[PDB]
Nucleic acid binder design. Structure first.
Ligand SMILES: [K+]
Ligand SMILES: [Mg+2]
Ligand SMILES: [Mg+2]
Ligand SMILES: [Mg+2]
Ligand SMILES: [Mg+2]
Ligand SMILES: [Mg+2]
Ligand SMILES: [Mg+2]
Ligand SMILES: [Mg+2]
Ligand SMILES: [Mg+2]
Ligand SMILES: [Mg+2]
Ligand SMILES: [Mg+2]
Ligand SMILES: [Mg+2]
Ligand SMILES: [Mg+2]
Ligand SMILES: [Mg+2]
Ligand SMILES: [Mg+2]
Ligand SMILES: [Mg+2]
Ligand SMILES: [Mg+2]
Ligand SMILES: [Mg+2]
Ligand SMILES: [Mg+2]
Ligand SMILES: [Mg+2]
Ligand SMILES: [Mg+2]
Ligand SMILES: [Mg+2]
Ligand SMILES: [Mg+2]
Ligand SMILES: [Mg+2]
Ligand SMILES: [Mg+2]
Ligand SMILES: [Mg+2]
Ligand SMILES: [Mg+2]
Ligand SMILES: [Mg+2]
Ligand SMILES: [Mg+2]
Ligand SMILES: [Mg+2]
Ligand SMILES: [Mg+2]
Ligand SMILES: [Mg+2]
Ligand SMILES: [Mg+2]
Ligand SMILES: [Mg+2]
Ligand SMILES: [Mg+2]
Ligand SMILES: [Mg+2]
Ligand SMILES: [Mg+2]
Ligand SMILES: [Mg+2]
Ligand SMILES: [Mg+2]
Ligand SMILES: [Mg+2]
Ligand SMILES: [Mg+2]
Ligand SMILES: [Mg+2]
Ligand SMILES: [Mg+2]
Ligand SMILES: [Mg+2]
Ligand SMILES: [Mg+2]
Ligand SMILES: [Mg+2]
Ligand SMILES: [Mg+2]
Ligand SMILES: [Mg+2]
Ligand SMILES: [Mg+2]
Ligand SMILES: [Mg+2]
Ligand SMILES: [Mg+2]
Ligand SMILES: [Mg+2]
Ligand SMILES: [Mg+2]
Ligand SMILES: [Mg+2]
Ligand SMILES: [Mg+2]
Ligand SMILES: [Mg+2]
Ligand SMILES: [Mg+2]
Ligand SMILES: [Mg+2]
Ligand SMILES: [Mg+2]
Ligand SMILES: [Mg+2]
Ligand SMILES: [Mg+2]
Ligand SMILES: [Mg+2]
Ligand SMILES: [Mg+2]
Ligand SMILES: [Mg+2]
Ligand SMILES: [Mg+2]
Ligand SMILES: [Mg+2]
Ligand SMILES: [Mg+2]
Ligand SMILES: [Mg+2]
Ligand SMILES: [Mg+2]
Ligand SMILES: [Mg+2]
Ligand SMILES: [Mg+2]
Ligand SMILES: [Mg+2]
Ligand SMILES: [Mg+2]
Ligand SMILES: [Mg+2]
Ligand SMILES: [Mg+2]
Ligand SMILES: [Mg+2]
Ligand SMILES: [Mg+2]
Ligand SMILES: [Mg+2]
Ligand SMILES: [Mg+2]
Ligand SMILES: [Mg+2]
Ligand SMILES: [Mg+2]
Ligand SMILES: [Mg+2]
Ligand SMILES: [Mg+2]
Ligand SMILES: [Mg+2]
Ligand SMILES: [Mg+2]
Ligand SMILES: [Mg+2]
Ligand SMILES: [Mg+2]
Ligand SMILES: [Mg+2]
Ligand SMILES: [Mg+2]
Ligand SMILES: [Mg+2]
Ligand SMILES: [Mg+2]
Ligand SMILES: [Mg+2]
Ligand SMILES: [Mg+2]
Ligand SMILES: [Mg+2]
Ligand SMILES: [Mg+2]
Ligand SMILES: [Mg+2]
Ligand SMILES: [Mg+2]
Ligand SMILES: [Mg+2]
Ligand SMILES: [Mg+2]
Ligand SMILES: [Mg+2]
Ligand SMILES: [Mg+2]
Ligand SMILES: [Mg+2]
Ligand SMILES: [Mg+2]
Ligand SMILES: [Mg+2]
Ligand SMILES: [Mg+2]
Ligand SMILES: [Mg+2]
Ligand SMILES: [Mg+2]
Ligand SMILES: [Mg+2]
Ligand SMILES: [Mg+2]
Ligand SMILES: [Mg+2]
Ligand SMILES: [Mg+2]
Ligand SMILES: [Mg+2]
Ligand SMILES: [Mg+2]
Ligand SMILES: [Mg+2]
Ligand SMILES: [Mg+2]
Ligand SMILES: [Mg+2]
Ligand SMILES: [Mg+2]
Ligand SMILES: [Mg+2]
Ligand SMILES: [Mg+2]
Ligand SMILES: [Mg+2]
Ligand SMILES: [Mg+2]
Ligand SMILES: [Mg+2]
Ligand SMILES: [Mg+2]
Ligand SMILES: [Mg+2]
Ligand SMILES: [Mg+2]
Ligand SMILES: [Mg+2]
Ligand SMILES: [Mg+2]
Ligand SMILES: [Mg+2]
Ligand SMILES: [Mg+2]
Ligand SMILES: [Mg+2]
Ligand SMILES: [Mg+2]
Ligand SMILES: [Mg+2]
Ligand SMILES: [Mg+2]
Ligand SMILES: [Mg+2]
Ligand SMILES: [Mg+2]
Ligand SMILES: [Mg+2]
Ligand SMILES: [Mg+2]
Ligand SMILES: [Mg+2]
Ligand SMILES: [Mg+2]
Ligand SMILES: [Mg+2]
Ligand SMILES: [Mg+2]
Ligand SMILES: [Mg+2]
Ligand SMILES: [Mg+2]
Ligand SMILES: [Mg+2]
Ligand SMILES: [Mg+2]
Ligand SMILES: [Mg+2]
Ligand SMILES: [Mg+2]
Ligand SMILES: [Mg+2]
Ligand SMILES: [Mg+2]
Ligand SMILES: [Mg+2]
Ligand SMILES: [Mg+2]
Ligand SMILES: [Mg+2]
Ligand SMILES: [Mg+2]
Ligand SMILES: [Mg+2]
Ligand SMILES: [Mg+2]
Ligand SMILES: [Mg+2]
Ligand SMILES: [Mg+2]
Ligand SMILES: [Mg+2]
Ligand SMILES: [Mg+2]
Ligand SMILES: [Mg+2]
Ligand SMILES: [Mg+2]
Ligand SMILES: [Mg+2]
Ligand SMILES: [Mg+2]
Ligand SMILES: [Mg+2]
Ligand SMILES: [Mg+2]
Ligand SMILES: [Mg+2]
Ligand SMILES: [Mg+2]
Ligand SMILES: [Mg+2]
Ligand SMILES: [Mg+2]
Ligand SMILES: [Mg+2]
Ligand SMILES: [Mg+2]
Ligand SMILES: [Mg+2]
Ligand SMILES: [Mg+2]
Ligand SMILES: [Mg+2]
Ligand SMILES: [Mg+2]
Ligand SMILES: [Mg+2]
Ligand SMILES: [Mg+2]
Ligand SMILES: [Mg+2]
Ligand SMILES: [Mg+2]
Ligand SMILES: [Mg+2]
Ligand SMILES: [Mg+2]
Ligand SMILES: [Mg+2]
Ligand SMILES: [Mg+2]
Ligand SMILES: [Mg+2]
Ligand SMILES: [Mg+2]
Ligand SMILES: [Mg+2]
Ligand SMILES: [Mg+2]
Ligand SMILES: [Mg+2]
Ligand SMILES: [Mg+2]
Ligand SMILES: [Mg+2]
Ligand SMILES: [Mg+2]
Ligand SMILES: [Mg+2]
Ligand SMILES: [Mg+2]
Ligand SMILES: [Mg+2]
Ligand SMILES: [Mg+2]
Ligand SMILES: [Mg+2]
Ligand SMILES: [Mg+2]
Ligand SMILES: [Mg+2]
Ligand SMILES: [Mg+2]
Lengths: 48, 275
RNA sequence: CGAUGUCGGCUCGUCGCAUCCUGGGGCUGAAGAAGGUCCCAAGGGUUGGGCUGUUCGCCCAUUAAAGCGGCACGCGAGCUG
RNA sequence: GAAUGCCGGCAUGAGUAACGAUAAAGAGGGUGAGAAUCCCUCUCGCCGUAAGCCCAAGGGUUCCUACGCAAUGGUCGUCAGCGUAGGGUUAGGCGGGACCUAAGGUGAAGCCGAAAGGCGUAGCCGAAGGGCAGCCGGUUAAUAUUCCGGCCCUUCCCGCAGGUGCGAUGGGGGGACGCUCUAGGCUAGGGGGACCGGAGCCAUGGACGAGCCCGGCCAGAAGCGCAGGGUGGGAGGUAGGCAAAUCCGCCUCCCAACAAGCUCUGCGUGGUGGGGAAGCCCGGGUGACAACCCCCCGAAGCCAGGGAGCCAAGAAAAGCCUCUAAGCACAACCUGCGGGAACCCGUACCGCAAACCGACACAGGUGGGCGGGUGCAAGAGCACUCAGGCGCGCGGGAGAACCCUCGCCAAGGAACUCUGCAAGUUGGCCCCGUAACUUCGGGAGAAGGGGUGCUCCCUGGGGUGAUGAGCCCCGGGGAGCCGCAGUGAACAGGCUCUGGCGACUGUUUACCAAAAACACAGCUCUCUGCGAACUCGUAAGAGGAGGUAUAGGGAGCGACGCUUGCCCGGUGCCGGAAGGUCAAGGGGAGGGGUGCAAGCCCCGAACCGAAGCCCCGGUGAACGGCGGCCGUAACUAUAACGGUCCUAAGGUAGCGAAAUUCCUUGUCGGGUAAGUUCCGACCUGCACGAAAAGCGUAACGACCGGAGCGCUGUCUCGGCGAGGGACCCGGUGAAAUUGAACUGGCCGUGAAGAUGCGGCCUACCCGUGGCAGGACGAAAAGACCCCGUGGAGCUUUACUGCAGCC
RNA sequence: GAGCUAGCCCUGGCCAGGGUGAAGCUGGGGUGAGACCCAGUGGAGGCCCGAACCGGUGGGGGAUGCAAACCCCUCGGAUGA
RNA sequence: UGGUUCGUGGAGCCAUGGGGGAAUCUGGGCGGACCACCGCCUAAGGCUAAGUACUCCGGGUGACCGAUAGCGCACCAGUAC
RNA sequence: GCGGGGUGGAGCAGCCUGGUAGCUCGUCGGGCUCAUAACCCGAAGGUCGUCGGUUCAAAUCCGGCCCCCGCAACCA
RNA sequence: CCGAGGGUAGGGCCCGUGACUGGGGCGAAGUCGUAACAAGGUAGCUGUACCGGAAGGUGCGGCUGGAU
RNA sequence: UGGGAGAGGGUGGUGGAAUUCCCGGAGUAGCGGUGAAAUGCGCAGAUACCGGGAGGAACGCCGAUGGCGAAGGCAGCCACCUGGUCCACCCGUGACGCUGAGGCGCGAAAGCGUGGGGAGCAAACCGGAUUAGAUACCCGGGUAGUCCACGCCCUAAACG
């Protein structure tokens, strides 16, 4: 059937994108948390 | 009149539509229309704040002149009478001798080609707007301001009207469409005559779709819901109310008066409404 | 109760006998024929339909007879639902 | 040594299931260590409104070539979307940006919030909407509207010339709009051609033919032509379009007006540039100096901002045109011409799939465009087939049971079963014909029947031509011919009668319920006078609504017809400047502590004192409720009638063994040979009843009963056949489960159902195909049940609080 | 976290072919004028049949699946909520 | 109302959202309701090292571990997935 | 299995709170009327379901038995 | 070709009959009330509407075939 | 041709008395109703009185045994539109007449549909009396309806 993952590059960057994270306290905390963990990528990769 | 159909489909059996006899122009004045922003009953939080709304026909908002005392003493010609989707009334296109074109809601019996005028010295004839004090007591009137210069707020719906009952100091006594008796300031403008298109209420939608065309989404009874949703929710099989009939939000909805008693306007309301 | 699937139907049998029919009998208020009643007998047999989910039961048309029970109310790693 | 323990390793099941659509293969020749599987050829089959092609998402080098086969590939592999290396994506015109706005987002000003933050007009951002300039062909192994060739065009900059009151983020016009139907003319596309060009072809009985097979175009500026969109001209006044205005708007006048003119597109032509098949010679050469014409069909596409009708009344902003303001009129803008300038990103490849979403090379899911021909009434349906693409990445055998999908069946014809479940039957089109009842629409495809092919003769009307031939579209009548059968194949209703429910089309439990449930137009109650009520929010602010009682919220009821009774004691709600109660506060008769005292301090009665409650009323389409015993009629039975107890009042009309009836398969009728169902009745209604509506109702229903007809493999009752499996061989090779096992029957025993204990009986060792009685077989720490001072959802006149409101 | 799903908002797109024949308009009859009747034209509709497309009614298969919802046959809607 | 051991308690102290609202030393606060006496202190402005907390980093040391341990990671790990 | 009830002839008080049986109808007797009904005036009639126990004393309180009507009977 | 007729299918009319139901007509002395006839003790009658055990009552209009 | 009387019809307007309600003022212990009463209303200030408003329906006196109309029926007053009818003059046309199965129209009250309106009245309904009963007559309330517009219904002691 139709499944849950319907990739959409714009939707990805707009929802989980770096600029989206930064615009919000919780999202900055995400970036902070992910940096502190030493995540190689802070934000999902998407080709714009 | 109101137009009936032959029962050539189940829905067409009872459906009635407006006769559109008074309509002389079938497109609006381009400079007097802005796009209407459909809400879907959602407020700026994106929350449904009025239920069961949306999906209706696209509409363009016709700017309506609810002041009229802008152009005092300047008469206008009733150039056309048109369809307005945003209200029950008809709207009359005015071509002022000024060159300015505006809309008013069209009063009953108002005729295309006639002249109308606004002001204290205006004649007492249909389509003219005057401050209430200069209008004879007992005269039928619509599009009445509630406060001076604040805009026509009263009796604007199709077939509605108010009647001037008398005078008291700086205020006049109106009988509003609701039957409520009220003190309205004398300096409030109003148009002599009743709102036209009285047959509006004789319209039988006929079928569900007609409701949807109007942006009125299906309304679901509380009785048909579950207790999480609504005080009338639950019960095995059908249930009677089982409590005082109530809203989804729990307040009582059969007789429970809800206007604020301490409202400053209570001093100006002579008699509560009718039936 | 870290599960022994629960009615009935179907299918498939198999067993018991308190025997429904067939076989052998005694007694009879057994003339004959047909019955009643008991005893011996489990070899085989024991129909098709209307109604109900029905087991059962009533009814129809027959029949030598249209038996009653057990097998986890036999049988859902066989099926039905 | 155990924790259904944790991590890992390795077993068992087992050479077992399976190897992923039943569209299908066979042979020859290559390559190579090795080939059913890679390459080539021929034959066969499949798709062809796709299973072909193009585009967008998404993917990200998967593209091309070379060299490879460890792993990946459900087998194999020499092949590959795999490994390694090299190469490949070219734009002013395509897309996106350097343009515009949409919802929304963000947000000068501003508002709000303990903080974080929430808002918010303008502005900005934001597209698959608007606006905007490239078409045809050639080329590469791989890119092409991008490179090249021809023919075109856009913007910016500067210069020249002519013109002009030039000048904007300002004003104005315009952009600018739905749905259904649709005219005229074109094209795209298609069919035919006795015409034109073309390698050849004469087979096997005939055919050298007016034969067969193949092809008969594409792009193109100005101009002209055809069709169409858009647009009135002039003057006078002007007070509106937040300044201005010669513009727009309004008034008046003349001129003219389904014309024309001017303008703008589509189409045809058009200098020019292309392209060009079958066949046989190895993607190429040839054909070829290819020809490149006529007729017909013809769009849903084009002219397109066309027209008509309708109600539900159908974006914005820029580009563009016009107007004026600062300014400026050496400027500046317009027009034409010339030269120069024109950036950033995408561009490979897959793209209904083996490269996207599904853990897989997964029978699933994925928007837009093109989608040829013939026939069947039409069509995107159906069968075949073109272009093109495929035979689905395990095979070879065999010809059991059994399973799946499939075909047929004598006689019967639902006897099967909970049920005609399933499968039959019916099946398109034309004609004839069609009942109750009805809301006059319908019920209708009711039912039921006839016709249907092919050949010859005669003929009627239309489209295109021209009024005619030819072509094409409907037809009508004659006479014939063949078959078992003519919508000869594929696709294409079984019908009827009668109840229950719901009016109806719709909606729902994604993934066990599609229903009688939800919605529904309609009805009635109730709230709400507008800074509405109500909703979200601490707030600001929003929705409501740029609405105004013919409007909005809430609730019930559920088209329609006829209706909707009595109870206001209780609860609810509504009304009630009395009275009773009532908190803070006001008051301070009067006490009290301390102080040598003034004083300080504490307590404190009467009275005044809000809502709320109490109290007086009203209120049912508000919550709800609508009796008991006993007796009486010139037969019995019954009780129109009476007596009496209680009630706030005692169930009205209608309907009733019901979707409700316990007794119950009530009784009686109907239908049947037989009817626990059904239909109709009756009424002592365990336990109907009037908007949680009552009783009806045409039409409708993949709803649920009952019946008949039709027809059948459902059945009596089974048989045979087909293919895909099951079986055999080669290849690859799982799984849950598993204390260990050397794992028989009976009668016992045993924690009460024993392969494992006793006694007896039986039994050589080991498998294969099958069956499912047992291993209280597997699976899931029973969802029922109880327990726990476990949890959660839900309720309320349980408790206690909180919002909200007073 | 609304790339699934539910609603709403904004902007686009899709719906072969056939059937039925409402209003209106015209003509005719009618009448004092009418209502009305007839015929033609017309092309309405949560109208009818039926693909795409959206569904998911009944049955079978599947059930360590092709698939953690699929396949076949069948069936609902298909200008509209 | 909050803080303190103080949960309304005889509830002072400190802090303050609301109402009322002084004085400048003969002023004012405090010593646990209050009053008297005896005393303590000087509100309504601000600053101030050190002694204290911590270990991302460097070093030293262990009756700490020794690759299922020790950090999640001894290894190209916040990686592959 | 649980509740309520049994009292002049009929229907209901009294029982709770022991001593005292009452209301309406009916029945009888007398009136009015030509007569009946209505109406008027009088009167009777229960020993309280039944047996036991408590009490000085039982319709009353308690227990058992007959009765008479209601209500229940769920999880499978 | 026509064709008696047989068969299939659906209509129309008529008659008989049917659980039950609806009132009607008649039936020596049944139960309840007393609506009408005398102003019948509320003048009657009436068309219609609603209601009630029943006659009946009531509303709105009408009539006199009513007043004394 | 000239003239007359008339609640004939239709439309729009508009006037006063009264009833009810509401507000304001004054005022107190009852008012109301009946055969007599009760219910009901009233110290929460009713009745009775004066002033203010709102609203609906019906038109007193004239008014008669009267007039009009085909009937049903028609009554404050104004205006507009319109029918019928009588008279007079003796002008015109020359039997153009009478009746009328069907048709068609009109048709009191009640009733019905969709709206509006609703003061008074009042079926139904409730209550208080009466009564053996009283689903009646009398009393206190009260919903349809009475009223308007449009559409139906088409009956009558539609009678002279
Ligand atoms: K249970
Ligand atoms: Mg996933
Ligand atoms: Mg994207
Ligand atoms: Mg996108
Ligand atoms: Mg997106
Ligand atoms: Mg973002
Ligand atoms: Mg890194
Ligand atoms: Mg992130
Ligand atoms: Mg209609
Ligand atoms: Mg109109
Ligand atoms: Mg605009
Ligand atoms: Mg927002
Ligand atoms: Mg938001
Ligand atoms: Mg709401
Ligand atoms: Mg909404
Ligand atoms: Mg309008
Ligand atoms: Mg609408
Ligand atoms: Mg609803
Ligand atoms: Mg529910
Ligand atoms: Mg919720
Ligand atoms: Mg709730
Ligand atoms: Mg409820
Ligand atoms: Mg119920
Ligand atoms: Mg319920
Ligand atoms: Mg409630
Ligand atoms: Mg509220
Ligand atoms: Mg009011
Ligand atoms: Mg158990
Ligand atoms: Mg088990
Ligand atoms: Mg179980
Ligand atoms: Mg004998
Ligand atoms: Mg004998
Ligand atoms: Mg014997
Ligand atoms: Mg035997
Ligand atoms: Mg049986
Ligand atoms: Mg049994
Ligand atoms: Mg039985
Ligand atoms: Mg015998
Ligand atoms: Mg048993
Ligand atoms: Mg069993
Ligand atoms: Mg089973
Ligand atoms: Mg079973
Ligand atoms: Mg079941
Ligand atoms: Mg151990
Ligand atoms: Mg395990
Ligand atoms: Mg093995
Ligand atoms: Mg095995
Ligand atoms: Mg598989
Ligand atoms: Mg395969
Ligand atoms: Mg090959
Ligand atoms: Mg390999
Ligand atoms: Mg290698
Ligand atoms: Mg592999
Ligand atoms: Mg391999
Ligand atoms: Mg594989
Ligand atoms: Mg090799
Ligand atoms: Mg270029
Ligand atoms: Mg630049
Ligand atoms: Mg922008
Ligand atoms: Mg913001
Ligand atoms: Mg953005
Ligand atoms: Mg764009
Ligand atoms: Mg472009
Ligand atoms: Mg071009
Ligand atoms: Mg200019
Ligand atoms: Mg517009
Ligand atoms: Mg439309
Ligand atoms: Mg055309
Ligand atoms: Mg063709
Ligand atoms: Mg001007
Ligand atoms: Mg100006
Ligand atoms: Mg050549
Ligand atoms: Mg035109
Ligand atoms: Mg147009
Ligand atoms: Mg805008
Ligand atoms: Mg100069
Ligand atoms: Mg110019
Ligand atoms: Mg740049
Ligand atoms: Mg490219
Ligand atoms: Mg596609
Ligand atoms: Mg692929
Ligand atoms: Mg594969
Ligand atoms: Mg696939
Ligand atoms: Mg066809
Ligand atoms: Mg294959
Ligand atoms: Mg074999
Ligand atoms: Mg057969
Ligand atoms: Mg048969
Ligand atoms: Mg049957
Ligand atoms: Mg069977
Ligand atoms: Mg069934
Ligand atoms: Mg059946
Ligand atoms: Mg067929
Ligand atoms: Mg037929
Ligand atoms: Mg033939
Ligand atoms: Mg069909
Ligand atoms: Mg039934
Ligand atoms: Mg339903
Ligand atoms: Mg339905
Ligand atoms: Mg549902
Ligand atoms: Mg479901
Ligand atoms: Mg579910
Ligand atoms: Mg699920
Ligand atoms: Mg299912
Ligand atoms: Mg359905
Ligand atoms: Mg409905
Ligand atoms: Mg209704
Ligand atoms: Mg809220
Ligand atoms: Mg608004
Ligand atoms: Mg509903
Ligand atoms: Mg309902
Ligand atoms: Mg009917
Ligand atoms: Mg009550
Ligand atoms: Mg009350
Ligand atoms: Mg009450
Ligand atoms: Mg009711
Ligand atoms: Mg109650
Ligand atoms: Mg009653
Ligand atoms: Mg019954
Ligand atoms: Mg019942
Ligand atoms: Mg029963
Ligand atoms: Mg029976
Ligand atoms: Mg029986
Ligand atoms: Mg019987
Ligand atoms: Mg049944
Ligand atoms: Mg009975
Ligand atoms: Mg209810
Ligand atoms: Mg109810
Ligand atoms: Mg019914
Ligand atoms: Mg029906
Ligand atoms: Mg259905
Ligand atoms: Mg078979
Ligand atoms: Mg086979
Ligand atoms: Mg392998
Ligand atoms: Mg035992
Ligand atoms: Mg054992
Ligand atoms: Mg042993
Ligand atoms: Mg032993
Ligand atoms: Mg077994
Ligand atoms: Mg088993
Ligand atoms: Mg556990
Ligand atoms: Mg357990
Ligand atoms: Mg469990
Ligand atoms: Mg238990
Ligand atoms: Mg415990
Ligand atoms: Mg608990
Ligand atoms: Mg969504
Ligand atoms: Mg989405
Ligand atoms: Mg079509
Ligand atoms: Mg069509
Ligand atoms: Mg149509
Ligand atoms: Mg349809
Ligand atoms: Mg398509
Ligand atoms: Mg299915
Ligand atoms: Mg089926
Ligand atoms: Mg199955
Ligand atoms: Mg499954
Ligand atoms: Mg499928
Ligand atoms: Mg359809
Ligand atoms: Mg204490
Ligand atoms: Mg304290
Ligand atoms: Mg102290
Ligand atoms: Mg403070
Ligand atoms: Mg001091
Ligand atoms: Mg202090
Ligand atoms: Mg101190
Ligand atoms: Mg002290
Ligand atoms: Mg101190
Ligand atoms: Mg100080
Ligand atoms: Mg320090
Ligand atoms: Mg160690
Ligand atoms: Mg060591
Ligand atoms: Mg480690
Ligand atoms: Mg270790
Ligand atoms: Mg480390
Ligand atoms: Mg680790
Ligand atoms: Mg990672
Ligand atoms: Mg007592
Ligand atoms: Mg006593
Ligand atoms: Mg005598
Ligand atoms: Mg007497
Ligand atoms: Mg004693
Ligand atoms: Mg005693
Ligand atoms: Mg005693
Ligand atoms: Mg329970
Ligand atoms: Mg014959
Ligand atoms: Mg009488
Ligand atoms: Mg009488
Ligand atoms: Mg009398
Ligand atoms: Mg009388
Ligand atoms: Mg009389
Ligand atoms: Mg009675
Ligand atoms: Mg009455
Ligand atoms: Mg008389
Ligand atoms: Mg007083
Ligand atoms: Mg003469
Ligand atoms: Mg003469
Ligand atoms: Mg009337
Ligand atoms: Mg009438």
């Amino acid at each position: 059937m139709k499944r849950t993952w319907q990739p959409n590059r714009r939707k990805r960057a707009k929802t989980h994108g770096f600029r989206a994270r930064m615009r919000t306290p919780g999202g900055r905390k995400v970036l902070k948390r992910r940096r502190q963990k030493g995540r190689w990528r802070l934000t999902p990769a998407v080709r714009k | 009149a109101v137009k009936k159909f032959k029962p050539y489909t189940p829905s067409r059996r009872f459906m009635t539509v407006a006769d559109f006899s008074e309509i002389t122009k079938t497109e609006p004045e381009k400079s007097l229309v802005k796009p209407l922003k459909k809400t879907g009953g959602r407020n700026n939080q994106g929350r449904i704040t009025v239920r069961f709304r949306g999906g209706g026909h696209k509409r363009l908002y016709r700017i309506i002149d609810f002041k009229r005392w802008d152009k005092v003493g300047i008469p206008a010609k009733v150039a056309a009478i048109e369809y307005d989707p945003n209200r029950s009334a008809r709207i009359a296109l005015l071509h002022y001798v000024d060159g300015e074109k505006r809309y008013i809601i069209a009063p009953d019996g108002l005729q295309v080609g006639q002249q109308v005028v606004a002001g204290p010295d205006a004649p007492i004839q249909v389509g003219n707007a005057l401050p209430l004090r200069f209008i004879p007591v007992g005269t039928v009137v619509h599009a009445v301001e509630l406060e001076p210069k604040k805009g026509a707020k009263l009796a604007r719906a199709a077939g509605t009207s108010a009647q001037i009952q008398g005078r008291e100091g700086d205020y006049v006594i109106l009988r509003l469409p609701s039957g409520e008796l009220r003190k309205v300031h004398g300096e409030c403008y109003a148009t002599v005559g009743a709102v036209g298109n009285a047959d509006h209420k004789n319209i039988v939608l006929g079928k569900a779709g007609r409701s949807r065309w109007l942006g009125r989404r299906p309304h679901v009874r509380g009785a048909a819901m579950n207790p999480v949703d609504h005080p009338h929710g639950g019960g095995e099989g059908r249930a009677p109310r089982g409590r005082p009939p109530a809203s989804p939000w729990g307040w009582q909805t059969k007789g429970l008066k809800t206007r604020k008693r301490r409202k400053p306007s209570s001093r100006f309301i002579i008699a509560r409404r009718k039936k």
